[model samples]
Target chain A: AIFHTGSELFIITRGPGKLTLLTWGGLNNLRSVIGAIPTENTGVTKWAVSFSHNYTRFSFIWEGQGEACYQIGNGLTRSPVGRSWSSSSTIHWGSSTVITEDVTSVVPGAVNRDKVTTAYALPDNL
Target chain B: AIFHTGSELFIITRGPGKLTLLTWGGLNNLRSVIGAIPTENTGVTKWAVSFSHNYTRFSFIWEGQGEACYQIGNGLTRSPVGRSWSSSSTIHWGSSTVITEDVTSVVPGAVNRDKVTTAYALPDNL
Candidate 1:
């Protein structure tokens, strides 16, 4: 699936028990990859791509028996790692039994960065 | 500037006497970069992004006092390097003096592979 909101373009693909999300945009066309998420659970998995104002914050989430999330902010905002899924955010795909769902509202706000696991600039030269 | 056509999204940036074009798409969301083209001319440099059917063939061209072009095929098809601009293809950016022009028609067809240079796979992991 593909999505465009504000100044961002997102491309997502699902395989086996994994999901890959690619983001391309920003002032410099920086690219971010949240590749190969292990959706280790039975039944359908929930997923979403959320953005903050002007895409200052962008994130992807998936939930089932287990869940994980990742996010980034502009090019300079520190991207948090190992975040939990937020139910307040609009879910863009699936639930517990469905495989795909039409994306409804995409929650937008400041991406919380309460925890910092790592710091790396999303590469722009790839 | 950003453009979406077929299964591809392109982002272009202009710098002092240089142009950068980035392509994102393909079955695996592969990314291609033709960065930092030297549009070394006194007047506005011409530029364009062209694609063949289903984005099997993609190219970026810039012409001014001198010209340089690059192209790639589907991840598997060999990508040619150091090619010349095809005037027959639509000019999407400028002619010789204009800084910006509304993109009219984008020329599309089989990207000729008459000359073989270096070959590399467009990276999908990025």
Candidate 2:
């Protein structure tokens, strides 16, 4: 939630339990979520970032697993990319996108690169 | 970053780009991170959640790939669980932990499952 705005970076950690989507400028308790991770894994969780305007165009690299892709912004829900649920080791757990390069192009004057906006992460107990 | 408790849930999407760590009560600008994802292979990104107080234990699942694991909290960096950089499709991601059952035991009295605290996601340009 510390938005200084320079370069995008994220440390993806795969644990267990539950994570919820609460408020914007409030508490973000992850301890409850990190405590419930599974233990049948051999490889560690991983993450990455990338972007492309064309809904059908996107990509990324991963460890243990390999390459991958998914939809972004408004095009996300309608895309064929299935939700990552009860996944295995070789899965890309984390991801992101570029503002200027990916969003501004497709979103046109609607994509605001100046302000670091919101992206909710709520835990789905499956 | 919403912290509505009850059933924690997260939607992990991977495209191509950079990621970063920012403030907790601020704007979680993933746009700067999401747009940096990479594209190469086939498998898509995935995510999961599990837990364990014993640093020596963890687990998860992926779509294209298979089983996986990683460290959590203070034990994050030291563990062999490498950072998710330029991840491929088959990478298990998007993780969290339960509150009362998972956290309370390990964290002891300090673990309060009532309030949703902070878990910052900064953009790591790689």
Candidate 3:
């Protein structure tokens, strides 16, 4: 049901080379744009985006000219994580070559990355 | 004691070149003279800095001349998910590049890049 109003932090961007990704929140809801690939600047193309939440785990790597692609998703797992760490050089177009947002797994030195963005609840209301 | 005091995004910097990273909170004040690498104007050196937070991931990658490398952290994960997208070409001595605050990823399609500054808890609490 697309839940995540942790004041907002769930984000996405793709194609024509515009990569923007921010995590923390889940129960998935970013369902579309399953095609794009045409860069070297020809009206512009190159995208394969996906996202999810409610479980947490993300990775979206995209290199340029020399080619590289990636996508990893989790949060009850259903959509994104469209693997491709290296497609042998997708021909230059930059922004984001690696990004992983959440998995809530780290009990470190100080911990308080902006505290709570809506305090994880999904289970229909966990 | 050291539970994020809010308002401020508690940050840190170190040797060689200066790198600044801002995250939500914590109580592990930056403790001292980690190493650094010298460059260009001599009064320098590259740095091998590291940072942390309760349960996440982060890093700071730096490279060299004819080779550039940079990763000031915050691709989401821990204190920083520092990693370079390329290699060999780090020969400059001024200014910072790339930054992420609060750990609250970004949401676009037309989103405001500015929102809250302070409004939370840390009474030795959660």
> What's the DockQ for every one of the candidates?
0.03, 0.03, 0.02
Of candidate 1 chain B, the 10-residue stretch with the lowest lDDT total is B114-123
TM-score of 2: 0.17
TM-score of 3: 0.19
Runs off by more than 4 Å, candidate 3:
A1-22, A25-56, A61-126, B1-15, B24-126
Clashing pairs in 1: none
Interface RMSD of each: 16.8, 15.9, 18.0
User: On lDDT, who's better, 2 or 3?
Assistant: 3
lDDT-sorted candidate list, best first: 1, 3, 2
Q: What's the distance in Å from true for residue A73, model 1?
A: 9.4
Summarize candidate 2's per-residue lDDT along A6-119 as a digit string, tens digits. Answer: 222221323331211111111232111111112222322222121111112221111223222222322222112111221211111122332111111222223221111112
Q: Which digits, one per residue and each the tens of the lDDT, describe model 3 over residues B1-126?
A: 111111112222222232322221222332211112222322322222222222122212333322222323222212332323232111111123333222223111211211111111111101
Taking all chains together, each candidate's TM-score versus the true structure is: 0.24, 0.17, 0.19
List TM-score (chain A only) for every prediction. Answer: 0.28, 0.18, 0.21
lDDT of 1 by residue, A1-126 (tens): 112211122222222243322221222332322323343335332222222111122333332233333321111222222223332222222121112322223222222221111111111221
Candidate 1 steric clashes: 0
- Ten consecutive residues with minimal summed lDDT in candidate 2 chain A? A17-26
Tens digits of lDDT, candidate 1, B76-99 = 221222223332222122121112
Residue A21 of candidate 3: its Cα lDDT?
24
